[PDB]
Amino acid sequence: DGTLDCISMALTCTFNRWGTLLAVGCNDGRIVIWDFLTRGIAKIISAHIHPVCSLCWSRDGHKLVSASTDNIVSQWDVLSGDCDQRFRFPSPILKVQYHPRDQNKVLVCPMKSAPVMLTLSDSKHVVLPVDDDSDLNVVASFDRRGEYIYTGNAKGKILVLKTDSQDLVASFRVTTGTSNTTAIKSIEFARKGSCFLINTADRIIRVYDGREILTCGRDGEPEPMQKLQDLVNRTPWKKCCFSGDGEYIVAGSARQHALYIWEKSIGNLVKILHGTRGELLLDVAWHPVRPIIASISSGVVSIWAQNQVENWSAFKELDENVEYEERESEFDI
Amino acid sequence: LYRACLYERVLLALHDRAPQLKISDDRLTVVGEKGYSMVRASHGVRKGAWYFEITVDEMPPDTAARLGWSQPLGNLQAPLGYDKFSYSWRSKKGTKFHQSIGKHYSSGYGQGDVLGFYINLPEDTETAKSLPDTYKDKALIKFKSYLYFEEKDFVDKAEKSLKQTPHSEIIFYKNGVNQGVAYKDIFEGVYFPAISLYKSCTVSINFGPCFKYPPKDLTYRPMSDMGWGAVVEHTLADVLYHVETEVDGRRSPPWEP
């Protein structure tokens, strides 16, 4: 539905705060900041020699946190492209995430170690707690306002901490239905409201409302707002994301390189988008204020927009025949 | 063959209604759904003076029936007065409508009006001043499941000269009370009582023997009387046509009647 030839080795992308720019990582380890309106590249940053697998914009948009595969995280000013700060860790980093309401702070999910929240002003770090002490794979994310931290382990356990004190404000383990746990693949939140989603190893996305987890307390049984899956193919989900408003949810079937689109309230599947059967789906993102969806597959990015009835359909356009309502004086002088 | 009419009394002929015109024989009321339409009675006047009524059973604001007379050539989809061969009244305010022209030379109309309609056309002498021969056409057809007869009707007249039938007139009454003269200028050609419907209008025509405020004239005739008169006349028409084609010769008495 529209691709870009000007970028190669697309690996990970991230919309800015207003959905005007897109920073995509490349295998060479370069940042390609490409613009939507001019439909061209806005910037090229020599980030790492190692490909970049995690990228996040700052709220003001002037900072981008990038993670190399060399366990090298670095902050870059979008105007200049300089490495503002640079750090390295053990257990290679799985993800970075700016704090949405404090760009000085940034959480980092490493591979084998617990996620740690650092600051840029001071090169300090706060190691977030781990429930089972043996997960070795815990994804973590700020909420919409950056007030709480949601951490999900490979054993389905879900901890909600407060971002400042790291104190356990809520907890619950998700189930595979019967009695078993499932590897929490990812935690996503809505940029609007409080609904969030969890991708798990059961190939079943679970949509909740964080207020219900907060009122559920520690070690409770919160039910999901929704349960979403491909009941037909039972396909895993490499990457999923909400819509900009938060009423549409998309999942990327890397198994068959497709895109499933459900709703939030009803949860019925909006639609499906099919990509090149030969392409391996890698990354998925939604335009924050547009029905536009960016996909990264086999190093190539594709764009999926959604237009209205007009752009040619605007006499007064009607859809179905209209019986004329004759009047009393319809034949009168 | 014969022109036998599917009617117990002289009623609104179903043969001369539009496909968008509904009837209820509980009161023989007529109703429609979209715009205007026109229906006519079974009979048709050619001479003399006569009289009938229309009873209105439903008149919402977006419901305006029209009631009057119309000659053949009257397109039954038009609102009874759109052409020069029809003269009616609009049932919102008493307004005479002819040639689609509305005239306020009339009284006021009421929602529950039982309106009387008097009309006098001259004898066929002053109507034709010549032969009023009635050589009829008759064609047999077998439509989907029933037999029917086709005849040739008159053609759209381009008449633009005014030659009113002598001493012919139309008078309108509200419950017998004289609403006044409607049209003195009456063109030649047979006329029949007609009803036009707007969106969901409920009105019905009615004859004389069950009347409410009838005139006591000894010359005017109810709907039923002229009805069986015309029925017998068309019976004789069939008689004479089968005579013509079947037996040599024809002969009729001293012409005057």
XYZ file of C-alpha atoms in Angstrom:
590
model
C 0.000 0.000 0.000
C 3.042 2.200 -0.542
C 6.711 1.563 0.240
C 9.916 3.612 0.356
C 12.942 2.821 -1.806
C 15.179 5.439 -0.179
C 15.837 3.424 3.008
C 17.456 0.001 3.239
C 17.932 -2.570 6.005
C 14.842 -1.346 7.854
C 14.858 -3.070 11.236
C 12.930 -0.930 13.720
C 10.946 2.285 13.402
C 9.297 4.741 15.759
C 6.863 7.591 15.185
C 7.563 11.003 16.661
C 5.083 12.554 19.080
C 2.911 13.977 16.285
C 3.428 11.349 13.595
C 5.464 13.619 11.331
C 8.837 11.828 11.323
C 9.909 8.182 11.441
C 13.289 7.088 12.789
C 14.146 3.664 11.342
C 17.195 1.640 12.294
C 19.317 -0.061 9.667
C 21.591 -3.097 9.680
C 24.615 -0.857 9.207
C 23.621 0.659 12.543
C 22.374 3.937 11.067
C 19.325 5.998 11.976
C 17.294 7.105 8.974
C 14.817 9.781 10.045
C 12.332 9.921 7.172
C 9.553 12.484 6.835
C 5.942 11.704 5.988
C 4.871 14.980 4.415
C 7.857 15.610 2.154
C 7.976 11.810 1.826
C 11.760 11.895 2.121
C 14.590 11.220 4.532
C 15.108 14.068 6.994
C 18.302 12.903 8.700
C 20.984 10.210 8.727
C 22.793 9.466 11.990
C 25.833 7.207 12.352
C 24.501 5.560 15.496
C 26.411 2.276 15.773
C 28.380 -0.174 13.698
C 25.866 -2.695 15.172
C 22.250 -2.679 13.961
C 19.746 -0.804 16.106
C 16.912 -2.854 17.613
C 15.240 -0.292 19.906
C 14.359 3.324 19.136
C 12.270 5.894 20.992
C 11.488 9.576 20.478
C 11.498 12.201 23.186
C 8.318 14.053 24.110
C 9.690 17.292 22.692
C 10.965 15.084 19.866
C 14.468 16.540 20.147
C 15.944 13.360 21.668
C 16.001 9.772 20.445
C 17.224 6.825 22.493
C 18.767 4.040 20.409
C 20.011 0.580 21.361
C 22.625 -1.242 19.323
C 23.086 -4.977 19.246
C 26.478 -4.249 20.852
C 24.622 -3.605 24.130
C 25.334 0.068 23.414
C 22.566 2.541 24.217
C 22.947 6.137 23.096
C 20.896 9.330 23.144
C 20.955 11.529 20.052
C 19.666 15.021 19.358
C 17.429 14.842 16.310
C 18.605 18.210 14.992
C 22.332 17.467 15.268
C 22.629 13.686 15.463
C 25.253 13.787 18.219
C 25.556 10.994 20.771
C 24.315 12.914 23.798
C 25.027 10.029 26.177
C 26.240 6.469 25.751
C 26.096 3.469 28.080
C 26.796 -0.257 27.904
C 25.556 -3.201 29.949
C 25.657 -6.994 30.215
C 22.778 -9.187 29.045
C 22.201 -7.340 25.734
C 19.418 -4.774 25.786
C 16.039 -5.926 24.510
C 14.323 -2.541 24.653
C 14.620 1.098 25.653
C 11.789 3.462 26.538
C 11.918 7.162 27.355
C 9.756 8.158 30.274
C 6.737 9.846 28.660
C 6.576 12.690 31.193
C 10.299 12.942 32.008
C 12.682 12.540 29.081
C 15.617 12.609 31.508
C 14.501 9.162 32.661
C 14.529 6.071 30.453
C 13.736 2.452 31.246
C 15.772 -0.350 29.689
C 14.768 -3.995 29.354
C 17.919 -6.116 28.934
C 18.024 -9.704 27.739
C 18.883 -11.680 30.869
C 18.883 -9.030 33.603
C 16.060 -7.060 35.152
C 14.914 -3.804 33.524
C 16.716 -0.774 34.932
C 15.572 2.850 34.884
C 18.355 5.376 34.271
C 18.497 9.150 34.057
C 20.404 11.264 31.568
C 21.185 14.167 33.903
C 22.891 11.805 36.356
C 24.292 8.508 35.059
C 22.499 6.614 37.814
C 20.302 3.548 37.531
C 17.521 1.929 39.566
C 17.148 -1.828 39.160
C 13.473 -2.701 39.171
C 12.429 -5.662 41.340
C 11.701 -9.135 39.991
C 8.952 -11.278 41.504
C 10.207 -14.812 40.899
C 13.942 -13.946 40.919
C 14.433 -16.426 38.065
C 12.525 -15.003 35.086
C 15.638 -13.857 33.170
C 13.193 -12.460 30.593
C 10.925 -9.649 31.795
C 9.491 -7.037 29.477
C 8.631 -3.687 31.057
C 6.870 -0.499 30.029
C 5.723 2.847 31.342
C 2.006 3.559 31.354
C 0.502 6.386 29.288
C 1.605 9.054 31.783
C 4.743 7.367 33.095
C 3.269 6.967 36.583
C 3.536 3.173 36.806
C 5.787 0.451 35.420
C 4.263 -2.759 34.077
C 6.638 -5.727 34.093
C 5.724 -9.113 32.654
C 7.871 -12.209 33.046
C 8.321 -15.342 30.981
C 6.142 -17.023 33.637
C 3.022 -14.923 33.054
C 3.537 -12.915 36.241
C 2.661 -9.231 35.952
C 3.913 -6.619 38.412
C 2.694 -3.030 38.482
C 5.193 -0.835 40.309
C 5.176 2.892 40.894
C 7.735 4.602 38.691
C 9.261 6.625 41.530
C 9.462 4.123 44.393
C 9.454 0.846 42.417
C 6.965 -0.317 45.047
C 4.592 -3.121 44.108
C 1.280 -1.350 43.546
C -0.436 -4.281 41.797
C 0.236 -7.862 40.763
C -1.351 -10.823 39.001
C -0.326 -13.779 36.867
C -1.989 -14.324 33.507
C -3.227 -17.820 32.675
C -3.220 -20.047 29.612
C -6.802 -20.836 30.567
C -6.316 -24.142 32.339
C -3.598 -23.541 34.949
C -0.388 -22.690 33.063
C 1.727 -19.588 32.568
C 2.855 -18.101 29.270
C 5.875 -16.041 28.262
C 4.874 -12.379 28.262
C 6.031 -11.388 24.793
C 5.337 -7.669 25.174
C 3.349 -4.994 27.010
C 1.853 -2.080 25.091
C -0.192 0.883 26.274
C -2.540 3.396 24.677
C -1.334 6.944 24.094
C -4.928 7.948 24.914
C -6.914 6.703 27.890
C -5.881 3.754 30.042
C -6.456 0.590 27.989
C -3.344 -1.500 27.425
C -2.527 -4.806 25.750
C -0.292 -7.802 26.389
C 1.185 -10.049 23.727
C 1.958 -13.468 25.174
C 3.432 -16.760 24.035
C -0.046 -18.261 23.754
C -0.509 -16.151 20.601
C -3.426 -14.532 22.457
C -3.443 -10.783 22.981
C -5.043 -9.735 26.259
C -6.473 -6.226 26.542
C -6.970 -4.755 30.011
C -7.721 -1.413 31.634
C -4.982 -0.434 34.065
C -7.424 1.085 36.544
C -8.941 -2.366 36.948
C -5.508 -3.788 37.746
C -4.861 -0.995 40.240
C -8.187 -1.698 41.966
C -7.531 -5.436 41.667
C -4.561 -4.978 43.991
C -1.654 -7.339 44.441
C -2.124 -11.009 43.522
C -5.620 -10.693 42.132
C -7.666 -12.090 39.230
C -8.242 -9.191 36.809
C -10.041 -10.187 33.702
C -9.020 -8.757 30.318
C -11.024 -6.104 28.561
C -10.666 -8.330 25.501
C -9.111 -11.546 24.224
C -7.825 -11.436 20.661
C -6.384 -14.169 18.472
C -6.439 -15.832 15.068
C -8.871 -18.618 15.884
C -8.422 -19.756 12.271
C -4.646 -20.040 11.896
C -3.399 -19.787 15.511
C -0.638 -17.427 14.421
C 1.999 -15.868 16.683
C 2.366 -12.106 16.872
C 5.831 -10.638 16.381
C 4.626 -7.105 17.133
C 1.293 -5.450 17.897
C 0.099 -1.937 18.603
C -2.996 0.119 19.352
C -4.440 2.774 17.117
C -3.631 6.400 17.815
C -7.017 6.907 19.445
C -6.882 3.509 21.126
C -10.000 1.913 19.617
C -8.250 -0.241 16.997
C -5.593 -2.887 17.585
C -3.255 -4.423 15.020
C -1.159 -7.583 15.189
C 1.628 -8.653 12.864
C 1.535 -12.276 11.755
C 5.187 -12.825 10.928
C 4.286 -16.472 10.320
C 2.412 -15.486 7.144
C 3.373 -11.781 6.955
C -0.122 -10.426 7.496
C -1.730 -7.757 9.652
C -4.855 -8.339 11.723
C -6.964 -5.381 12.815
C -9.540 -5.712 15.606
C -11.520 -3.152 17.561
C -11.248 -2.403 21.267
C -14.800 -2.236 22.628
C -16.361 -4.993 20.536
C -13.045 -6.569 19.619
C -14.273 -7.796 16.245
C -11.652 -7.977 13.517
C -11.734 -4.775 11.500
C -9.731 -6.201 8.622
C -6.615 -7.983 7.371
C -3.742 -6.678 5.258
C -1.632 -9.144 3.277
C 2.009 -8.444 2.486
C 4.498 -10.140 0.209
C 4.244 -13.850 0.949
C 8.042 -13.980 0.653
C 8.676 -11.158 3.133
C 9.468 -11.893 6.777
C 7.507 -9.469 8.947
C 9.668 -7.796 11.595
C 8.289 -4.486 12.906
C 4.865 -2.847 13.199
C 3.760 0.659 14.149
C 0.695 2.871 13.816
C 0.590 6.549 12.951
C -0.367 8.265 16.235
C -2.866 10.660 14.650
C -3.527 9.004 11.293
C -5.012 5.726 9.987
C -1.496 5.087 8.675
C 0.476 1.983 9.577
C 4.197 1.421 9.058
C 5.523 -2.096 8.528
C 9.125 -3.310 8.419
C 9.674 -6.645 6.684
C 12.861 -8.051 5.132
C 14.472 -4.642 5.599
C 11.755 -2.883 3.574
C 9.137 -0.497 4.958
C 5.545 -0.365 3.729
C 2.839 2.188 4.464
C -0.867 1.444 4.895
C -3.222 4.420 4.889
C -7.009 4.582 4.998
C -8.945 7.201 3.024
C -12.533 8.455 3.205
C -15.292 8.275 0.569
C -14.087 11.463 -1.143
C -10.983 12.291 -3.237
C -13.252 11.616 -6.185
C -16.819 11.294 -4.822
C -17.267 14.979 -3.919
C -24.172 17.480 -7.238
C -24.867 15.833 -3.877
C -23.555 12.274 -3.863
C -25.980 9.591 -2.683
C -25.607 5.825 -2.350
C -29.123 4.400 -2.806
C -32.127 5.550 -4.805
C -34.338 8.163 -3.146
C -38.109 8.216 -3.593
C -39.114 11.832 -4.131
C -41.492 13.076 -1.429
C -44.277 14.844 -3.312
C -45.919 17.801 -1.578
C -49.477 19.053 -1.277
C -48.768 22.010 -3.584
C -46.403 19.839 -5.643
C -48.575 20.388 -8.733
C -50.024 23.727 -7.612
C -48.986 27.005 -9.195
C -69.501 -11.103 -25.225
C -70.804 -8.359 -22.939
C -69.577 -5.359 -20.934
C -70.696 -6.883 -17.609
C -69.299 -4.755 -14.782
C -67.884 -6.287 -11.585
C -69.995 -4.074 -9.336
C -73.084 -4.449 -7.180
C -73.715 -0.694 -7.466
C -72.267 2.150 -9.521
C -68.867 2.545 -7.868
C -65.335 3.795 -8.569
C -64.276 1.759 -11.599
C -61.116 -0.249 -10.940
C -60.366 -0.231 -14.677
C -59.517 3.491 -14.561
C -57.190 3.824 -11.580
C -53.469 4.285 -11.387
C -51.260 1.397 -10.194
C -50.441 3.583 -7.150
C -54.109 3.888 -6.105
C -55.520 1.770 -3.265
C -59.195 1.137 -2.498
C -61.049 -0.065 0.585
C -64.523 -1.357 -0.249
C -65.492 -1.212 3.433
C -66.227 2.417 2.547
C -64.897 2.265 -1.045
C -62.430 4.878 0.152
C -59.411 5.651 -1.999
C -55.874 6.262 -0.725
C -52.359 6.695 -2.094
C -48.757 6.726 -0.937
C -46.661 9.060 -3.124
C -47.760 12.346 -4.664
C -51.119 12.698 -6.378
C -53.229 10.249 -8.370
C -56.720 10.104 -9.832
C -59.610 7.632 -9.804
C -63.033 7.848 -11.428
C -66.467 6.306 -10.966
C -68.060 3.582 -13.086
C -70.613 5.876 -14.745
C -70.228 8.949 -16.943
C -72.601 11.824 -17.664
C -73.509 12.906 -21.194
C -76.568 15.120 -20.591
C -78.972 16.370 -17.957
C -78.355 17.445 -14.385
C -77.148 15.158 -11.618
C -75.506 15.085 -8.238
C -73.355 12.967 -5.911
C -71.194 13.417 -2.824
C -67.726 12.839 -1.415
C -67.241 11.872 2.235
C -63.810 12.609 3.724
C -62.620 10.239 6.452
C -59.022 11.422 6.982
C -57.265 14.727 6.223
C -53.930 15.235 8.005
C -52.039 18.450 7.167
C -49.819 16.667 4.625
C -53.002 15.117 3.228
C -54.926 17.146 0.635
C -57.455 15.368 -1.549
C -59.070 17.001 -4.565
C -62.597 16.268 -5.722
C -64.445 17.101 -8.903
C -65.181 16.104 -12.488
C -62.994 15.079 -15.395
C -63.571 14.171 -19.029
C -61.720 11.289 -20.694
C -58.177 12.235 -21.812
C -57.669 12.793 -18.079
C -54.340 11.270 -17.081
C -55.195 9.381 -13.879
C -51.717 10.038 -12.482
C -52.298 13.839 -12.560
C -54.003 15.682 -9.680
C -57.480 16.126 -11.170
C -57.230 19.570 -12.690
C -53.741 19.632 -14.138
C -55.302 19.601 -17.634
C -58.094 21.654 -19.202
C -60.480 18.674 -19.189
C -60.719 18.446 -15.389
C -62.301 20.765 -12.822
C -61.940 19.993 -9.120
C -61.683 21.471 -5.637
C -58.658 21.361 -3.350
C -59.508 20.004 0.100
C -57.339 22.351 2.150
C -59.258 25.558 1.526
C -62.163 25.471 -0.886
C -60.326 26.413 -4.060
C -61.414 25.572 -7.592
C -58.569 23.976 -9.547
C -58.589 23.758 -13.335
C -55.725 23.878 -15.837
C -53.598 23.547 -12.676
C -54.822 27.079 -11.892
C -56.241 27.694 -8.430
C -59.096 30.147 -7.962
C -60.512 31.358 -4.650
C -63.994 31.902 -6.132
C -65.208 29.414 -3.540
C -66.058 28.790 0.107
C -63.967 27.149 2.836
C -63.410 23.418 3.248
C -63.548 21.436 6.481
C -61.718 18.292 7.553
C -64.930 16.329 8.108
C -66.846 17.696 5.146
C -69.568 15.620 3.503
C -69.502 17.582 0.262
C -72.313 17.557 -2.287
C -71.559 17.932 -5.990
C -74.219 19.144 -8.440
C -73.580 19.404 -12.171
C -75.812 20.138 -15.167
C -74.748 19.549 -18.758
C -77.121 20.288 -21.664
C -78.779 17.624 -23.754
C -76.655 16.016 -26.465
C -78.283 18.465 -28.896
C -76.510 21.525 -27.495
C -73.513 19.274 -26.787
C -72.997 18.122 -30.386
C -75.596 19.857 -32.613
C -75.036 16.796 -34.796
C -75.023 12.993 -34.672
C -74.097 11.611 -31.210
C -73.397 8.196 -32.730
C -71.671 5.690 -30.461
C -70.065 3.148 -32.774
C -68.060 1.126 -30.270
C -64.813 -0.813 -30.516
C -64.642 -4.280 -28.975
C -61.558 -6.492 -28.780
C -61.259 -9.780 -26.920
C -58.137 -10.547 -24.903
C -57.227 -13.292 -22.454
C -54.937 -11.703 -19.889
C -52.865 -13.930 -17.573
C -55.865 -15.798 -16.134
C -59.025 -13.922 -17.176
C -60.853 -12.591 -20.231
C -61.183 -8.852 -20.850
C -62.226 -6.369 -23.533
C -60.261 -3.535 -25.109
C -61.790 -0.448 -26.709
C -60.317 2.647 -28.338
C -60.493 5.811 -26.229
C -60.350 9.435 -27.333
C -57.126 11.257 -28.220
C -55.532 14.287 -26.563
C -57.505 17.270 -27.837
C -55.599 20.383 -28.909
C -58.750 22.442 -28.351
C -57.774 26.019 -27.526
C -61.044 27.736 -28.520
C -63.711 28.304 -25.879
C -67.141 26.947 -26.822
C -68.883 26.320 -23.512
C -71.678 23.781 -23.472
C -74.848 25.921 -23.353
C -76.349 26.492 -19.896
C -74.047 23.911 -18.291
C -72.772 24.577 -14.786
C -71.283 23.061 -11.635
C -72.417 23.816 -8.082
C -70.654 22.853 -4.851
C -72.370 22.232 -1.512
C -70.986 21.713 1.988
C -73.370 19.248 3.654
C -76.083 20.485 1.296
C -75.380 24.134 2.133
C -74.572 25.878 -1.140
C -70.839 26.509 -1.377
C -71.642 28.145 -4.713
C -70.999 27.854 -8.418
C -67.600 26.400 -9.326
C -67.410 26.397 -13.144
C -69.937 27.788 -15.607
C -67.659 27.330 -18.621
C -67.842 23.602 -19.372
C -66.252 22.108 -22.479
C -67.915 19.413 -24.563
C -67.295 15.711 -24.102
C -68.589 13.327 -21.464
C -67.501 13.899 -17.873
C -67.228 11.617 -14.868
C -66.807 12.255 -11.130
C -63.197 11.908 -10.054
C -61.044 11.973 -6.932
C -57.365 12.903 -6.677
C -55.232 11.695 -3.788
C -52.209 13.338 -2.267
C -50.017 11.366 0.138
C -52.406 9.189 2.195
C -55.770 10.865 1.585
C -58.965 9.028 2.583
C -62.135 10.022 0.695
C -65.044 8.186 -0.917
C -67.767 8.860 -3.480
C -71.412 8.243 -2.658
C -74.745 8.025 -4.487
C -78.175 9.433 -3.700
C -80.536 6.914 -2.013
C -78.374 6.934 1.151
C -77.832 10.658 1.135
C -77.546 13.050 4.086
C -78.473 16.515 2.685
C -80.009 15.846 -0.731
C -81.591 18.446 -3.001
C -85.305 17.913 -3.544
C -85.136 18.497 -7.296
C -87.226 16.164 -9.436
C -84.863 16.395 -12.421
C -81.418 15.668 -10.973
C -80.363 12.028 -10.851
C -78.218 10.166 -8.284
C -75.037 8.301 -9.182
C -76.792 4.920 -9.333
C -79.481 6.087 -11.763
C -77.120 7.445 -14.421
C -74.961 4.404 -13.704
C -77.547 1.830 -14.706
C -78.606 4.158 -17.522
C -75.124 4.046 -19.032
C -74.893 0.302 -18.326
C -78.102 -0.369 -20.270
C -76.909 2.010 -22.998
C -73.686 0.040 -23.455
C -75.720 -3.181 -23.437
C -77.644 -1.776 -26.400
C -74.313 -0.746 -27.924
C -73.166 -4.371 -27.841
C -76.576 -5.357 -29.244
C -76.290 -2.937 -32.155
C -72.679 -3.794 -32.998
C -73.415 -7.531 -33.064
C -76.476 -6.692 -35.176
C -74.384 -4.664 -37.650
C -71.755 -7.357 -38.099
C -74.211 -10.271 -37.889
C -77.418 -9.203 -39.684
C -77.885 -6.840 -42.619
C -79.779 -3.661 -41.843
C -80.337 -1.142 -39.065
C -83.203 1.149 -38.080
C -83.951 3.595 -35.237
C -87.083 5.572 -34.289
C -87.846 9.310 -34.735
C -84.497 10.680 -33.797
C -85.283 13.146 -31.014
C -84.730 10.791 -28.067
